[PDB]
Amino acid sequence: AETADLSASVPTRPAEPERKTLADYGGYPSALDAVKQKNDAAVAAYLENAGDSAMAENVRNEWLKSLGARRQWTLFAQEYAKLEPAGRAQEVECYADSSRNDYTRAAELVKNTGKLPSGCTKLLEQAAASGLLDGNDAWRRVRGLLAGRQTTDARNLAAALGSPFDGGTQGSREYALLNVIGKEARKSPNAAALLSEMESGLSLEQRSFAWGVLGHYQSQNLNVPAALDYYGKVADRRQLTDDQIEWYARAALRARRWDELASVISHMPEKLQKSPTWLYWLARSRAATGNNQEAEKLYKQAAATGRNFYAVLAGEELGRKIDTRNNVPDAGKNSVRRMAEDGAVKRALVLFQNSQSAGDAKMRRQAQAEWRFATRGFDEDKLLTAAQTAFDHGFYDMAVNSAERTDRKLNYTLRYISPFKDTVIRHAQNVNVDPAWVYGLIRQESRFVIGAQSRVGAQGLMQVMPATAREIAGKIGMDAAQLYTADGNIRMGTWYMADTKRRLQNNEVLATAGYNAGPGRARRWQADTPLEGAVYAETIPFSETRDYVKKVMANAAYYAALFGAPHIPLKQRMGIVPAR
Ligand SMILES: CC(=O)N[C@H]1[C@@H]2OC[C@@H](O2)[C@@H](O[C@@H]2O[C@H](CO)[C@@H](O[C@@H]3O[C@H](CO)[C@@H](O)[C@H](O)[C@H]3NC(C)=O)[C@H](O)[C@H]2NC(C)=O)[C@@H]1O
Ligand SMILES: [Zn+2]
Ligand SMILES: [Zn+2]
Ligand SMILES: [Zn+2]
Ligand SMILES: [Zn+2]
C-alpha cells in the first residue's frame, strides 16, 4: 500500500578534526609494533587517545591475540569488553572461549581441514584432549593438515587425540601415509600403485582420503579420466576436504556425468550444497536425468542468492530476465551530506582525500578499512545513502561496496556504476568490443579506481601490465607511457580485450580468462572436445581466474541490461568454448 521511499536517518557519531585523524594514523604502525614487542603501556596509551576507528579496533584485536597467547586474562577481559561484537577477530573469539575452558566452537572449527590461527588451533587441541571432539572429524582434520603440510599442527592434534605420530597405531599410520598424500608424492606416476598395495592395512577413512588426494591432483590438473578413476575409488566421499570434493564435482561436470555429479554434490557439507555454484549444477543434473520438478525448486533457490553468476543462470532456466530498475529512489541530497558528518564516515573520507593529494597507497587502504568499519552496522537505507556519499567524493570502490550489501532495496546504478562513460564507449566501439563486457571487466579489475596498481605492477582502470602496454602501443601508434593516463589506459585495455578475443577463436569466455592469466593459459584449459562456457569457467584450475571469469561475465550481464543493449541471455553470452 506504500510507494517506495528512503529513510533520511543517519548516524551522528562524534567527529574529530582532520589533524587528529592524521595523527592517529601517524601512530598506528607504532601501536602495532608495541603489541608485537609486548609494550602494554604503549598500546594502552594509544587506545586511550585514539578515536573509535578501524585503527583502534585493529590494534585492540592484535593486542587481545597477544594477551590471549600470554594468558593475561584480567586485561584480556577488560579489553574484549570494549570491542564491538561484530568487530571481533576469529582468533580473539577462540581465546575468549578458551579463557573459560569453553569448547562450544570446536564442533564447527574441527570441520576446517587447513591452517587456523594459533588461538583456534589450541582450542581444538584442548577439546581433543578433553574428549569433546567427534572422532571422525578430528582425524579428518589431521589428514587434511598433513596434506597441506601443516605437519606440526597435525602432530599436536594427533597427540591430543591419544594416538601420537611417534607411538600411536592410528597416529603413525596416518603419518606414514605421506608417501602417497605428500605435496610431491601425490604427483608421482606410481602413487596409485603404492596406494593400491597398502589398501589392505588402512581404514575405510584413510583410503577414502588418500584416493581423494590423488583424484584432486589429477582433476585440478585437467586430467579428467585419471581424476574420475581415483575419485571413483573413494568409498566415503564425506571423508574428503571441501577442495577435494569440489574438484570431484568439477571432474564429473567436465565429463558430463550428471548422475555422478549429483551423487558427489549430495555428499558435500550443507554450506557447500547451498552455495550458488552447487545449487545450480545439482539443478542442471536433476534436469538432465529427467527430474524437472526437483530441478525447478533448485533453480529457485539458486536464483534467490542475489546478484551473481549462478543466480543469473538459474533465473534464466526459470525464464526470468535481469531487471535493473531500481526499486527505491535516490537518497536526498541533505541525507547524503549529513552522512559525511558522521564521525566514522568522515574519518574514512579524510584518509581518502589525504591519500589522493599524497599518492599514498597504504593510507588509501586504511580509508577503505575505515569505510567498512564506519558502515558495518548499517541497515539498507543507510547503506544506500552512504553509497551515494562515497560516489560524490570519488571514493568509487566504496560506493559499490556499500550498494552491493543490500538485499531487498536495490539500487543497480550504485551497484553497477559507470563513470568515464564517454571514454569507455568511444574506445570500445573503435576496436569493436561490447561496452557491457568492458565495464564488467573494469568493475572486477579495479572497481573504477584510476590509480589502481596491483602487486606485480598491473596499472590503471584496466590493470594493464607494463610489458603488454609496450606491445600494444607499438601496434597502434601510441607511446607506452600513455599506460599511465586514464584515456590511454582504456585505449590499451579495450584493444587487448579485442586482440585476445580474436586470437582465442572469437570467444569472450576464453578472452576474459586470457586477459587475466594469459592467452597461453586460456588455451591450455581448453578440452579436446567443446565445452559449454559455464563448464569451462567452473573448471578453470587457478582459483583467482575462475572467480574472475564468473564475476566479469555476470557484471557484463547487468551492464548490458542497464545500458539497454539488445537482450543476450547469460547462457548464450557464455556460449560454447571450442575444442583445442
Ligand atoms: C597479480 C595480477 O595483477 N595478476 C593479473 C592482473 O590481471 C590482468 C593482468 O594483471 C594479468 O596479466 C595478464 O598476465 C599475462 C601473463 O600471465 C599476460 O599475458 C602475456 O602477455 C602476452 C599476451 O599477448 C604474451 O606474450 C605472453 O605469452 C602472455 N602470457 C601467457 C601466460 O600467455 C597478459 O597480457 C596480462 N594482461 C594484461 C591486461 O596486461 C596479471 O597476471
Ligand atoms: Zn554415500
Ligand atoms: Zn565532503
Ligand atoms: Zn579517448
Ligand atoms: Zn587484476
XYZ file of C-alpha atoms and ligand atoms in Angstrom:
626
model
C 0.000 0.000 0.000
C 3.023 2.347 0.149
C 5.223 3.690 -2.616
C 8.954 3.122 -2.035
C 10.944 5.741 -0.056
C 14.358 6.019 1.598
C 14.734 6.863 5.304
C 16.744 10.054 5.929
C 18.110 8.598 9.241
C 21.932 8.983 9.587
C 24.301 8.138 12.474
C 25.743 11.065 14.351
C 28.855 9.536 15.947
C 31.256 12.176 17.321
C 33.601 13.669 14.710
C 37.219 14.646 15.282
C 39.293 17.207 13.316
C 41.389 16.322 10.265
C 44.607 16.753 12.297
C 43.657 14.250 14.976
C 42.735 11.631 12.309
C 46.133 12.014 10.606
C 47.922 11.883 13.999
C 46.134 8.635 14.986
C 47.088 7.247 11.533
C 50.649 8.524 12.196
C 50.933 6.444 15.422
C 49.136 3.387 14.017
C 52.267 1.445 12.970
C 53.906 2.197 16.303
C 50.915 0.797 18.178
C 51.021 -2.446 16.148
C 54.778 -2.833 16.853
C 54.103 -2.132 20.556
C 51.711 -5.148 20.522
C 54.409 -7.359 18.899
C 57.058 -6.258 21.431
C 54.596 -6.577 24.306
C 54.820 -2.910 25.279
C 51.491 -2.929 27.095
C 51.774 0.661 28.338
C 52.401 1.930 24.815
C 49.364 0.011 23.461
C 47.138 1.245 26.337
C 48.274 4.840 25.722
C 47.438 4.627 22.010
C 43.922 3.233 22.690
C 43.272 5.827 25.422
C 43.833 8.696 22.948
C 42.589 7.286 19.600
C 39.109 7.728 18.224
C 36.647 4.791 17.851
C 38.043 3.722 14.442
C 39.126 0.706 12.451
C 42.699 1.604 13.503
C 41.863 1.384 17.192
C 39.796 -1.786 16.678
C 42.634 -3.421 14.771
C 45.148 -2.534 17.452
C 42.745 -3.813 20.136
C 42.261 -7.160 18.281
C 46.005 -7.719 17.780
C 46.615 -6.904 21.446
C 43.925 -9.373 22.549
C 45.578 -12.131 20.445
C 48.824 -11.339 22.291
C 47.108 -11.178 25.664
C 45.364 -14.483 24.985
C 48.531 -16.263 23.973
C 50.207 -14.948 27.135
C 47.183 -15.934 29.325
C 46.754 -12.396 30.579
C 43.070 -12.892 31.346
C 42.323 -9.849 33.546
C 43.470 -7.457 30.824
C 42.051 -9.611 28.049
C 38.520 -9.405 29.601
C 38.633 -5.649 30.212
C 39.656 -5.003 26.530
C 37.462 -7.642 24.962
C 34.515 -5.854 26.657
C 35.449 -2.748 24.612
C 35.204 -4.408 21.174
C 32.067 -4.149 19.112
C 30.911 -7.823 18.924
C 30.827 -7.665 15.092
C 34.449 -6.392 15.162
C 35.966 -9.402 16.981
C 38.659 -11.263 15.061
C 38.129 -15.003 14.774
C 41.181 -15.806 16.939
C 40.024 -13.337 19.626
C 36.638 -15.269 19.777
C 38.534 -18.514 20.372
C 40.752 -17.030 23.089
C 37.617 -15.527 24.770
C 36.063 -19.036 24.940
C 39.292 -20.994 25.710
C 39.649 -18.483 28.623
C 36.577 -20.134 30.216
C 37.657 -23.579 29.008
C 34.516 -23.494 26.847
C 34.663 -25.686 23.715
C 31.300 -24.893 22.095
C 33.074 -23.587 18.958
C 35.156 -26.783 18.393
C 32.368 -28.747 16.640
C 32.291 -26.219 13.741
C 36.032 -25.370 13.731
C 37.061 -29.050 13.580
C 35.405 -29.214 10.100
C 38.190 -26.901 8.817
C 40.967 -29.034 7.325
C 43.570 -26.225 6.845
C 45.640 -23.765 8.884
C 43.814 -21.945 11.685
C 45.202 -19.094 13.815
C 47.078 -20.322 16.853
C 44.326 -19.478 19.416
C 41.720 -21.569 17.477
C 44.258 -24.263 16.845
C 44.940 -24.607 20.580
C 41.210 -24.551 21.383
C 40.849 -27.634 19.141
C 43.765 -29.412 20.780
C 42.339 -28.794 24.220
C 38.895 -30.029 23.025
C 40.656 -33.122 21.676
C 42.430 -33.779 24.962
C 39.051 -33.350 26.691
C 37.230 -35.969 24.609
C 34.910 -33.317 23.223
C 35.720 -33.708 19.501
C 33.838 -36.022 17.198
C 36.499 -38.697 16.314
C 35.615 -38.893 12.589
C 36.022 -35.147 12.050
C 39.124 -34.831 14.300
C 41.101 -37.427 12.350
C 39.833 -35.933 9.084
C 41.327 -32.663 10.221
C 44.626 -34.472 10.983
C 44.818 -35.854 7.403
C 43.915 -32.503 5.854
C 46.696 -30.804 7.882
C 49.167 -33.456 6.681
C 48.042 -32.966 3.021
C 48.540 -29.251 3.238
C 51.911 -29.530 5.007
C 50.853 -28.252 8.452
C 52.699 -31.147 9.941
C 53.212 -29.560 13.354
C 49.553 -28.773 13.850
C 48.645 -32.314 12.665
C 51.210 -33.787 15.075
C 49.871 -31.897 18.044
C 46.275 -32.670 17.172
C 47.019 -36.415 16.853
C 48.921 -36.332 20.222
C 45.889 -34.672 21.842
C 43.560 -37.325 20.473
C 45.624 -40.022 22.210
C 47.401 -41.602 19.216
C 50.628 -39.724 18.531
C 52.641 -39.893 15.267
C 55.522 -41.442 17.276
C 53.870 -44.268 19.203
C 50.199 -44.442 18.350
C 48.906 -47.083 15.974
C 46.464 -44.727 14.178
C 48.864 -41.740 14.604
C 51.812 -43.459 12.914
C 49.610 -44.971 10.193
C 48.222 -41.506 9.286
C 51.773 -40.087 9.281
C 53.194 -42.964 7.125
C 50.554 -42.198 4.538
C 52.599 -39.160 3.451
C 54.374 -41.487 0.993
C 51.138 -41.028 -1.014
C 49.454 -37.821 0.186
C 52.657 -35.703 0.396
C 52.855 -32.494 -1.668
C 55.250 -34.150 -4.181
C 54.428 -37.820 -3.562
C 50.877 -37.287 -4.835
C 52.329 -36.169 -8.233
C 54.287 -39.481 -8.717
C 53.252 -41.705 -11.620
C 53.287 -44.610 -9.115
C 51.252 -43.011 -6.290
C 48.177 -45.069 -7.222
C 50.084 -48.375 -7.357
C 51.707 -47.601 -3.989
C 48.294 -46.764 -2.516
C 46.689 -49.911 -4.069
C 49.357 -52.032 -2.379
C 48.697 -50.563 1.124
C 44.895 -50.572 0.919
C 44.555 -53.742 2.964
C 46.202 -52.095 6.057
C 44.313 -48.756 6.034
C 40.913 -47.869 7.416
C 37.990 -47.010 5.130
C 38.524 -43.392 6.150
C 42.227 -43.366 5.381
C 41.651 -44.997 1.973
C 38.815 -42.578 1.010
C 41.004 -39.630 1.944
C 44.102 -40.881 0.125
C 42.259 -41.571 -3.191
C 40.741 -38.123 -2.689
C 44.270 -36.541 -2.644
C 45.243 -38.341 -5.894
C 41.956 -37.546 -7.638
C 42.210 -33.863 -6.650
C 45.749 -33.588 -8.014
C 44.669 -35.100 -11.370
C 41.427 -33.064 -11.563
C 42.943 -29.654 -10.869
C 45.496 -30.690 -13.476
C 42.643 -31.258 -16.007
C 43.420 -34.969 -16.448
C 39.755 -35.923 -16.131
C 39.777 -39.679 -16.916
C 42.513 -40.283 -14.302
C 40.799 -37.954 -11.763
C 37.494 -39.855 -12.162
C 39.263 -43.201 -11.819
C 40.812 -42.268 -8.398
C 37.806 -40.354 -7.107
C 35.746 -43.409 -8.096
C 37.758 -45.456 -5.531
C 36.728 -43.159 -2.646
C 34.328 -45.244 -0.531
C 33.136 -42.414 1.855
C 33.053 -39.131 -0.002
C 32.298 -37.287 3.225
C 35.948 -38.016 4.202
C 37.176 -35.565 1.542
C 38.200 -31.993 2.187
C 35.979 -29.319 0.717
C 38.510 -28.620 -2.035
C 38.846 -32.339 -2.909
C 35.100 -32.864 -3.160
C 34.523 -29.747 -5.302
C 37.258 -30.998 -7.726
C 35.475 -34.332 -7.878
C 32.356 -32.496 -8.850
C 34.345 -30.426 -11.393
C 35.786 -33.560 -12.936
C 32.269 -35.153 -13.333
C 30.928 -31.854 -14.691
C 33.692 -31.634 -17.271
C 32.944 -35.316 -18.277
C 29.154 -34.651 -18.444
C 28.486 -37.436 -15.933
C 25.294 -35.946 -14.483
C 24.412 -38.979 -12.296
C 27.892 -38.945 -10.627
C 27.787 -35.130 -10.274
C 24.506 -35.231 -8.329
C 25.859 -38.038 -6.178
C 29.048 -36.096 -5.349
C 27.088 -32.889 -4.503
C 24.804 -34.935 -2.171
C 27.928 -35.784 -0.091
C 29.005 -32.174 0.302
C 28.620 -30.267 3.583
C 25.345 -28.353 3.793
C 27.063 -24.936 3.474
C 28.615 -26.108 0.220
C 25.467 -27.732 -1.170
C 23.637 -24.394 -0.598
C 26.179 -22.201 -2.390
C 25.004 -20.696 -5.732
C 27.514 -22.981 -7.610
C 26.259 -26.379 -6.363
C 22.576 -25.449 -6.247
C 22.839 -24.595 -9.924
C 24.777 -27.672 -11.041
C 22.663 -30.032 -8.971
C 19.624 -28.433 -10.653
C 21.173 -28.965 -14.082
C 21.994 -32.551 -13.148
C 18.418 -33.235 -11.903
C 17.026 -31.804 -15.190
C 19.478 -33.927 -17.186
C 18.285 -37.142 -15.502
C 14.622 -36.338 -16.017
C 13.529 -34.792 -12.687
C 12.237 -31.304 -13.739
C 10.206 -30.696 -10.658
C 13.249 -31.196 -8.412
C 15.448 -29.183 -10.874
C 12.898 -26.368 -10.758
C 12.908 -25.980 -6.963
C 16.739 -25.996 -7.021
C 16.795 -23.258 -9.724
C 14.586 -21.097 -7.473
C 16.920 -21.341 -4.531
C 19.999 -20.667 -6.669
C 18.173 -17.582 -8.152
C 17.284 -16.283 -4.697
C 21.034 -15.969 -3.707
C 21.034 -12.479 -5.248
C 23.158 -10.782 -7.886
C 25.757 -13.299 -9.117
C 26.748 -15.571 -11.965
C 24.866 -18.722 -10.959
C 21.868 -16.839 -9.614
C 21.514 -15.204 -13.025
C 21.900 -18.516 -14.941
C 19.309 -20.147 -12.565
C 16.845 -17.293 -13.042
C 17.207 -17.860 -16.818
C 16.328 -21.560 -16.664
C 13.131 -20.363 -14.972
C 12.543 -17.872 -17.857
C 13.261 -14.744 -15.786
C 15.389 -11.983 -17.260
C 17.672 -9.496 -15.487
C 15.789 -6.396 -14.424
C 17.938 -3.441 -13.416
C 15.176 -0.982 -12.467
C 15.927 0.482 -9.039
C 13.077 -0.277 -6.561
C 13.870 2.695 -4.265
C 14.525 6.359 -5.048
C 17.965 8.020 -4.770
C 18.809 9.354 -1.288
C 18.011 13.041 -0.791
C 20.927 15.435 -1.085
C 20.533 16.543 2.553
C 20.885 12.988 3.935
C 23.849 12.426 1.628
C 25.511 15.490 3.135
C 24.687 14.582 6.745
C 26.027 11.023 6.256
C 29.545 12.615 5.649
C 29.255 14.484 9.001
C 29.106 11.135 10.947
C 32.455 10.762 12.816
C 33.451 7.370 11.341
C 32.348 8.157 7.786
C 34.161 11.431 7.965
C 37.314 9.674 9.168
C 37.254 7.376 6.160
C 36.744 10.370 3.887
C 39.592 12.313 5.469
C 42.024 9.404 4.938
C 40.724 9.112 1.394
C 41.346 12.708 0.384
C 44.685 12.850 2.151
C 45.794 9.726 0.338
C 44.952 11.417 -3.036
C 46.976 14.590 -2.607
C 49.917 12.496 -1.340
C 49.784 9.489 -3.709
C 49.788 7.241 -0.597
C 48.510 3.741 -1.311
C 48.788 2.494 2.272
C 46.715 5.409 3.562
C 44.146 4.667 0.866
C 43.883 1.061 2.066
C 43.261 2.414 5.539
C 40.458 4.752 4.255
C 38.780 1.594 2.836
C 39.083 -0.181 6.188
C 37.655 2.829 7.997
C 34.825 2.948 5.417
C 33.920 -0.737 6.003
C 34.160 -0.167 9.741
C 32.023 3.024 9.507
C 29.296 1.194 7.588
C 29.499 -2.253 9.188
C 26.358 -1.929 11.204
C 24.167 -0.140 8.560
C 20.627 -1.161 7.563
C 19.669 -0.936 3.895
C 18.626 2.713 3.899
C 21.861 3.966 5.469
C 23.851 1.772 3.118
C 22.292 3.392 0.025
C 22.787 6.793 1.478
C 26.455 6.036 2.314
C 26.990 4.585 -1.188
C 25.912 7.912 -2.706
C 28.097 9.719 -0.148
C 31.132 7.728 -1.399
C 30.224 8.245 -5.068
C 30.032 12.021 -4.652
C 33.510 12.066 -3.106
C 35.021 9.923 -5.942
C 35.547 7.000 -3.497
C 34.059 4.842 -6.231
C 35.048 1.425 -4.935
C 33.403 2.141 -1.526
C 30.305 3.383 -3.328
C 29.965 -0.098 -4.856
C 30.978 -1.926 -1.625
C 28.115 -0.271 0.273
C 25.460 -0.686 -2.516
C 26.121 -4.373 -3.156
C 25.392 -5.141 0.508
C 21.591 -4.600 0.341
C 19.062 -7.449 -0.203
C 15.512 -6.013 -0.636
C 16.159 -2.379 -1.531
C 18.149 -2.493 -4.821
C 19.971 0.385 -6.462
C 21.619 -1.066 -9.583
C 23.071 2.311 -10.597
C 25.229 2.278 -7.440
C 25.934 -1.477 -7.755
C 26.960 -1.119 -11.407
C 28.399 2.344 -11.650
C 29.675 3.574 -14.997
C 31.944 6.633 -14.669
C 34.154 7.618 -17.670
C 31.357 6.561 -19.988
C 32.229 8.778 -22.950
C 35.779 7.429 -22.901
C 34.953 3.759 -22.485
C 32.138 3.771 -25.064
C 34.237 5.588 -27.690
C 37.245 3.368 -27.414
C 35.320 0.138 -27.074
C 33.301 0.903 -30.219
C 36.548 1.729 -32.066
C 38.004 -1.743 -31.570
C 34.637 -3.398 -31.810
C 34.173 -4.813 -28.312
C 30.963 -4.849 -26.333
C 30.819 -1.952 -23.839
C 28.932 -4.080 -21.242
C 31.790 -6.559 -21.257
C 34.293 -3.682 -20.870
C 32.516 -2.314 -17.821
C 32.207 -5.812 -16.478
C 35.928 -6.185 -16.697
C 36.754 -2.775 -15.225
C 34.390 -3.320 -12.272
C 36.208 -6.554 -11.393
C 39.825 -5.419 -12.239
C 39.886 -2.091 -10.435
C 36.454 -1.247 -9.079
C 36.890 2.020 -11.122
C 39.925 3.329 -9.175
C 42.015 5.305 -11.779
C 45.269 4.877 -9.839
C 44.826 1.197 -9.091
C 48.044 -0.804 -9.110
C 48.450 -4.450 -8.427
C 51.338 -6.191 -6.561
C 53.085 -7.238 -9.790
C 52.617 -3.818 -11.318
C 49.376 -4.078 -13.369
C 48.273 -0.485 -13.772
C 45.122 1.517 -14.052
C 41.415 1.034 -14.590
C 42.008 -1.891 -16.865
C 45.012 -3.269 -14.961
C 47.277 -3.456 -17.993
C 50.754 -4.928 -17.463
C 53.691 -2.643 -18.474
C 55.105 -5.306 -20.873
C 51.685 -5.738 -22.584
C 51.310 -1.974 -22.827
C 54.624 -1.778 -24.755
C 53.479 -4.369 -27.283
C 50.131 -2.608 -27.771
C 51.486 0.918 -28.126
C 53.834 -0.176 -30.921
C 50.859 -1.624 -32.924
C 48.532 1.387 -32.669
C 50.657 4.482 -32.861
C 50.842 5.204 -29.142
C 53.596 5.933 -26.576
C 53.825 3.151 -23.965
C 53.804 5.928 -21.283
C 50.082 6.625 -22.035
C 49.529 3.478 -19.859
C 49.526 5.943 -17.003
C 46.622 8.194 -18.189
C 43.032 7.030 -17.821
C 42.344 7.557 -21.526
C 45.477 5.761 -22.799
C 44.781 3.036 -20.243
C 41.265 2.435 -21.552
C 42.573 2.555 -25.193
C 45.117 -0.167 -24.459
C 42.808 -2.337 -22.319
C 39.904 -2.353 -24.792
C 42.329 -3.065 -27.602
C 43.839 -6.007 -25.706
C 40.336 -7.353 -24.999
C 39.629 -7.258 -28.781
C 43.061 -8.673 -29.569
C 42.918 -11.561 -27.101
C 39.336 -12.349 -28.228
C 40.428 -12.510 -31.916
C 43.322 -14.843 -31.114
C 41.192 -17.147 -28.945
C 38.721 -18.135 -31.700
C 36.499 -15.057 -31.138
C 35.392 -16.331 -27.756
C 34.573 -13.860 -24.998
C 34.933 -16.501 -22.241
C 38.433 -17.612 -23.349
C 39.268 -13.886 -23.839
C 38.287 -12.979 -20.261
C 40.351 -15.908 -18.915
C 43.215 -14.910 -21.282
C 43.044 -11.278 -20.119
C 43.639 -12.309 -16.534
C 46.011 -15.328 -16.857
C 47.443 -15.037 -20.355
C 46.043 -16.394 -23.621
C 48.608 -19.241 -23.310
C 46.838 -20.440 -20.136
C 43.357 -19.940 -21.525
C 44.166 -22.365 -24.371
C 45.772 -24.947 -22.014
C 42.459 -25.074 -20.107
C 40.532 -25.931 -23.248
C 39.488 -29.580 -23.695
C 39.821 -31.841 -26.711
C 36.096 -31.528 -27.280
C 33.953 -28.407 -26.944
C 32.780 -27.236 -23.551
C 29.759 -25.235 -22.549
C 31.005 -21.805 -21.400
C 29.935 -22.252 -17.698
C 31.610 -25.658 -17.545
C 34.888 -24.114 -18.823
C 34.621 -21.248 -16.322
C 33.843 -23.597 -13.343
C 36.703 -25.944 -14.169
C 39.490 -23.290 -14.553
C 42.316 -24.613 -12.255
C 43.504 -21.190 -10.969
C 41.073 -20.049 -8.272
C 41.644 -16.326 -8.863
C 40.906 -16.626 -12.604
C 37.983 -18.995 -12.026
C 36.369 -16.469 -9.684
C 37.307 -13.606 -12.082
C 35.698 -15.019 -15.208
C 32.341 -15.664 -13.486
C 32.212 -12.182 -11.931
C 33.123 -10.414 -15.203
C 30.536 -12.326 -17.216
C 27.875 -11.704 -14.540
C 28.880 -7.990 -14.395
C 28.578 -7.776 -18.198
C 25.041 -9.261 -17.946
C 23.994 -6.495 -15.539
C 25.694 -3.706 -17.539
C 24.024 -4.897 -20.714
C 20.617 -4.588 -19.002
C 21.494 -1.165 -17.581
C 22.743 0.120 -20.966
C 19.614 -1.104 -22.809
C 21.726 -3.373 -25.099
C 19.711 -5.997 -27.122
C 18.939 -8.985 -24.774
C 21.514 -11.836 -24.996
C 20.868 -14.264 -22.090
C 23.999 -15.009 -19.948
C 23.846 -18.670 -21.043
C 24.096 -17.504 -24.652
C 26.764 -14.940 -23.746
C 28.732 -17.912 -22.221
C 28.177 -19.858 -25.485
C 30.403 -22.854 -26.235
C 34.151 -22.910 -25.766
C 35.545 -24.808 -28.785
C 37.857 -27.788 -28.854
C 41.606 -27.011 -28.663
C 48.572 -10.111 -9.821
C 47.998 -9.623 -11.130
O 47.968 -8.414 -11.388
N 47.502 -10.590 -11.946
C 46.898 -10.388 -13.260
C 46.252 -8.998 -13.430
O 45.007 -9.010 -14.141
C 45.258 -8.588 -15.502
C 46.778 -8.653 -15.602
O 47.077 -8.199 -14.299
C 47.343 -10.081 -15.677
O 48.307 -10.174 -16.699
C 47.988 -10.752 -17.836
O 49.141 -11.515 -17.479
C 49.539 -12.379 -18.540
C 50.792 -13.118 -18.070
O 50.346 -14.142 -17.219
C 49.761 -11.569 -19.845
O 49.867 -12.482 -20.903
C 51.171 -12.447 -21.516
O 51.406 -11.384 -22.455
C 51.414 -11.645 -23.857
C 49.940 -11.685 -24.301
O 49.673 -11.068 -25.546
C 52.216 -12.916 -24.275
O 53.436 -12.631 -24.946
C 52.523 -13.831 -23.099
O 52.753 -15.116 -23.615
C 51.351 -13.831 -22.117
N 51.338 -14.844 -21.046
C 50.660 -16.002 -21.161
C 50.700 -16.978 -19.997
O 50.023 -16.275 -22.185
C 48.633 -10.545 -20.187
O 48.980 -9.682 -21.277
C 48.306 -9.737 -18.955
N 47.151 -8.886 -19.109
C 47.189 -7.576 -19.220
C 45.831 -6.947 -19.337
O 48.249 -6.934 -19.234
C 48.009 -10.431 -14.325
O 48.803 -11.632 -14.343
Zn 27.234 -42.254 0.274
Zn 32.769 16.031 1.952
Zn 39.660 8.930 -25.598
Zn 43.540 -7.858 -11.798
